[PDB]
Design a protein around this ligand. Structure first.
Ligand SMILES: *[C@@H]1O[C@H](CO)[C@@H](O[C@@H]2O[C@H](CO)[C@@H](O[C@@H]3O[C@H](CO[C@H]4O[C@H](CO)[C@@H](O)[C@H](O[C@H]5O[C@H](CO)[C@@H](O)[C@H](O)[C@@H]5O)[C@@H]4O)[C@@H](O)[C@H](O[C@H]4O[C@H](CO)[C@@H](O)[C@H](O)[C@@H]4O[C@H]4O[C@H](CO)[C@@H](O)[C@H](O)[C@@H]4O[C@H]4O[C@H](CO)[C@@H](O)[C@H](O)[C@@H]4O)[C@@H]3O)[C@H](O)[C@H]2NC(C)=O)[C@H](O)[C@H]1NC(C)=O
Ligand SMILES: *[C@@H]1O[C@H](CO)[C@@H](O[C@@H]2O[C@H](CO)[C@@H](O[C@@H]3O[C@H](CO[C@H]4O[C@H](CO)[C@@H](O)[C@H](O)[C@@H]4O)[C@@H](O)[C@H](O[C@H]4O[C@H](CO)[C@@H](O)[C@H](O)[C@@H]4O)[C@@H]3O)[C@H](O)[C@H]2NC(C)=O)[C@H](O)[C@H]1NC(C)=O
Ligand SMILES: *[C@@H]1O[C@H](CO)[C@@H](O[C@@H]2O[C@H](CO)[C@@H](O[C@@H]3O[C@H](CO)[C@@H](O)[C@H](O[C@H]4O[C@H](CO)[C@@H](O)[C@H](O)[C@@H]4O)[C@@H]3O)[C@H](O)[C@H]2NC(C)=O)[C@H](O)[C@H]1NC(C)=O
Ligand SMILES: *[C@@H]1O[C@H](CO)[C@@H](O[C@@H]2O[C@H](CO)[C@@H](O[C@@H]3O[C@H](CO[C@H]4O[C@H](CO)[C@@H](O)[C@H](O)[C@@H]4O)[C@@H](O)[C@H](O)[C@@H]3O)[C@H](O)[C@H]2NC(C)=O)[C@H](O)[C@H]1NC(C)=O
Ligand SMILES: *[C@@H]1O[C@H](CO)[C@@H](O[C@@H]2O[C@H](CO)[C@@H](O[C@@H]3O[C@H](CO)[C@@H](O)[C@H](O)[C@@H]3O)[C@H](O)[C@H]2NC(C)=O)[C@H](O)[C@H]1NC(C)=O
Ligand SMILES: *[C@@H]1O[C@H](CO)[C@@H](O[C@@H]2O[C@H](CO)[C@@H](O)[C@H](O)[C@H]2NC(C)=O)[C@H](O)[C@H]1NC(C)=O
Ligand SMILES: *[C@@H]1O[C@H](CO)[C@@H](O[C@@H]2O[C@H](CO)[C@@H](O)[C@H](O)[C@H]2NC(C)=O)[C@H](O)[C@H]1NC(C)=O
Ligand SMILES: *[C@@H]1O[C@H](CO)[C@@H](O)[C@H](O)[C@H]1NC(C)=O
Lengths: 53, 128, 132, 43, 53, 53
């Protein structure tokens, strides 16, 4: 009863480096110069159509 | 965190040679110097030497030359570059050398000198 | 505790205000329009897009009468077929967002008229300083 | 059909080649032109 | 100019490693022939007459 | 900073910046694997058996 790994027939695989982690760190997306980011401050808002605030 | 872990307290004989290790963890070990200092009752502190773990360049106290020796061991892997070990072989043991030994590291601030020893080992008591 | 006028003086703080009241603060929108291993190329092309668009806008001012006045009197009459609204109703009723949709259809006529006016003004000033 | 005077433009070359598995290998053949192969020096 | 290769090749995927494919030549199906190109005699002699002129 | 008397219609479904974030996190996920170890030498015959249990 001899086996092999599954991905051998399609792709050589890459170990993750144990030094780097996978935990989420929060990104803040920022607009460059000459643009702006608007935010809907409304409460009842299905994401389509007018946002009054 | 910055951790300094020494070895246990040891009992030696006169004329012997003690080896004391100092494992350091939690920073890039190749950057900061490691100093060694001693504490004798009724004598206060006394400085022993420093070692720069990048190459191992050492400097000893003048009145301890010929007796002391300092080496280091670096971490050679791309996974744990943080830890390292310092050593101190203190030789020519006399009954006066019964003391508690500390391995220390300076701070990381900009106005920190070398001698403002921030982080301290727990100490190793040597009784001759 | 911050006050309504403080956030009025922020960036885009008068977009719902009347355009007569929004005219008091134009330098804020004009100021946050210039300054603010592979990713350096993306941020670098964003920065040069910003400065190149600012230069296009300053050139379109510069080919007209005003280089850095930020409020520019000029000498082409408003063809009243463009908007057919009264004066005090537009300076006290609408915002700028509401006005742009009213004049989006009648634009690039106005810019060509401004360039023609500036070319005529430069040749008339050339003749005036020529006979002097 | 082979004639001594004539030279074929193709050769039928068999060789060992590695596989997905580093322990195992396979005998496999291909066709090559005369201009891609040279002789290293019976067999 | 009309250039052609009258051979009917069959390629053959040979795996070298994980995700590695070497495309060899399998069997020849049909006649083993020699590739060539064709130009017309009249137009070529005409254009040589032009370039001499 | 708040912005009054304004009615901007939003749309989360034809929204951009979720397209480019889905591009960016994939590309950066790939960029955190280039210094790491390839498991090319490990595609090999395995002689497996049941764990002691
Ligand atoms: C792809 O990869 C494949 C994997 O490697 C590869 O296949 C291998 O290719 C090599 C070389 O081509 C093969 O070696 C040859 O094997 C012949 C087959 O004999 C085997 O099978 C017999 C059963 O039928 C066994 O009995 C035999 O074992 C006996 O012989 C051994 C010989 O050393 C001995 O040690 C054992 O104890 C046992 O007694 C063996 O297992 C084998 O016959 C051949 O030897 C001669 O025979 C041929 C005629 O049949 C000759 O044409 C050939 O050239 C050899 O001549 C040798 O001897 C002459 C007289 O002394 C010399 O003048 C020659 O120079 C030559 O001497 C060379 O070889 C000696 C070893 O034989 C060596 O000691 C010398 O120093 C000198 O180097 C030869 O051993 C191998 O078996 C193949 N393996 C498999 C699994 O097929 C393949 O070639 C690759 N390519 C392709 C396209 O597939
Ligand atoms: C997955 O499968 C692998 C299969 O190889 C397992 O690896 C072997 O596991 C067995 C059992 O777990 C190991 O056998 C034990 O080895 C110990 C250390 O070996 C030294 O001593 C022996 C002498 O017995 C020397 O021959 C050897 O060279 C070493 O110097 C021994 O101490 C053990 O002996 C004890 O148990 C036996 C049971 O019969 C008693 O008779 C003895 O008195 C003693 O109490 C035992 O022999 C073997 O060493 C492992 N091989 C390797 C290469 O590691 C994995 O353990 C398994 N893993 C899991 C999770 O299931
Ligand atoms: C959305 O919100 C904006 C922000 O508040 C709001 O604009 C405001 O509208 C009111 C009128 O509806 C404005 O009040 C007038 O503004 C004009 C501008 O020149 C003034 O001249 C007026 O002064 C007269 O009235 C005074 C007493 O009321 C008299 O003492 C004086 O002598 C004048 O006769 C008057 O102040 C107000 O200024 C604006 N504010 C801004 C920042 O534009 C808008 O109406 C709202 N729209 C909707 C649809 O909700
Ligand atoms: C790389 O190698 C991998 C390991 O072999 C391949 O993964 C497996 O490939 C098989 C196809 O050979 C997939 O399907 C299996 O097929 C056998 C036999 O197929 C018959 O039975 C099924 C049952 O539905 C039927 O649909 C077929 O038409 C045949 O009649 C079955 O016994 C299995 O149960 C299974 O259906 C495997 O699913 C697949 N593994 C996984 C985890 O998906 C892989 O395909 C290879 N890739 C390349 C690119 O070569
Ligand atoms: C101000 O508004 C009036 C609206 O009455 C504009 O007058 C009209 O202008 C258009 C072009 O802008 C004229 O159309 C022209 O028709 C001739 C017919 O041959 C054609 O050859 C031209 O190419 C062009 O399409 C239109 O005739 C004219 N109306 C009248 C009654 O003459 C006026 O141009 C506007 N002013 C400015 C500065 O835009
Ligand atoms: C098989 O091919 C070999 C060479 O690939 C042939 O050997 C020589 O081929 C050249 C031209 O390809 C001829 O000019 C030589 O006369 C050939 N040598 C001999 C001794 O005749 C070989 O003839 C081909 N056929 C066979 C049956 O081996
Ligand atoms: C190159 O090939 C083309 C085919 O694509 C030939 O063009 C045709 O030739 C036949 C003669 O057998 C004429 O009946 C067709 O009318 C041609 N078609 C076109 C679109 O021209 C062409 O003659 C060949 N050239 C040479 C020099 O042989
Ligand atoms: C602007 O002109 C177009 C025709 O070119 C017309 O369809 C559109 O309704 C006009 N816009 C307004 C606000 O009148």
């Amino acid at each position: 009863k001899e086996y092999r790994l599954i991905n051998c027939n399609t792709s050589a695989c890459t170990q993750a480096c144990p030094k780097v982690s996978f935990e989420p760190i929060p990104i803040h997306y920022c607009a460059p110069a000459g643009f702006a980011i608007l935010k809907c401050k409304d409460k009842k808002f299905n994401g389509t159509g007018p946002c009054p605030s | 965190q910055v951790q300094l872990v020494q070895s246990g307290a040891v009992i030696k004989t006169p004329g012997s040679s003690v080896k004391i290790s100092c494992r350091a963890s939690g920073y890039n070990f190749r950057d900061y110097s490691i100093h060694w200092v001693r504490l004798i009752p009724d004598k206060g502190f006394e400085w022993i030497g420093w070692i720069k773990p990048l190459w191992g360049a050492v400097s000893y106290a003048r009145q301890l030359q010929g007796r002391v020796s300092m080496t280091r061991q670096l971490s050679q892997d791309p996974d744990d570059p943080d830890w390292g070990v310092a050593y101190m072989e203190f030789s020519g043991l006399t009954p006066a050398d019964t003391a508690e030994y500390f391995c220390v590291r300076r701070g990381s601030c900009d106005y920190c000198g070398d001698f403002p020893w921030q982080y301290w080992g727990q100490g190793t008591v040597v009784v001759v | 505790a911050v006050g309504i006028g403080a956030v009025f003086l922020g960036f885009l703080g008068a977009a719902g205000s009347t355009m007569g009241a929004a005219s008091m603060t134009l330098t804020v929108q004009a100021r946050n329009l210039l300054s603010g291993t592979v990713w350096g190329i993306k941020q670098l092309q964003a920065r040069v897009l910003a400065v190149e668009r600012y230069l296009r806008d300053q050139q379109l001012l510069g080919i007209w009468g005003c280089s850095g006045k930020l409020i520019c009197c000029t000498n082409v009459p408003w063809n009243s077929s463009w908007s057919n609204r009264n004066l005090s109703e537009i300076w006290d009723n609408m915002t700028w967002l509401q006005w742009d949709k009213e004049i989006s259809n009648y634009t690039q006529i106005i810019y060509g008229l401004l360039e023609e006016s500036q070319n005529q003004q430069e040749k008339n000033e050339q003749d005036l300083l020529a006979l002097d | 059909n082979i004639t001594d005077d004539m030279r074929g433009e193709l050769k039928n070359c068999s060789f060992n080649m590695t596989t997905e598995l580093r322990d195992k290998k396979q005998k496999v053949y291909s066709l090559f032109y005369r201009l891609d192969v040279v002789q290293i020096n019976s067999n | 100019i009309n250039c052609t290769r009258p051979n009917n090749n069959t390629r053959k995927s040979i795996r070298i490693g994980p995700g590695q494919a070497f495309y060899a030549t399998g069997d020849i199906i049909g006649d083993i022939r020699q590739a060539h190109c064709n130009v017309s005699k009249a137009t070529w002699n005409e254009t040589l007459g032009k370039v001499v002129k | 900073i708040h912005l009054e008397n304004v009615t901007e219609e939003f749309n989360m479904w034809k929204n951009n910046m979720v397209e480019q974030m889905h591009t960016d996190i994939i590309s950066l996920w790939d960029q955190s694997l280039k210094p790491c170890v390839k498991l090319t030498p490990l595609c090999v015959t395995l002689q497996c058996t049941n764990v002691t249990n």
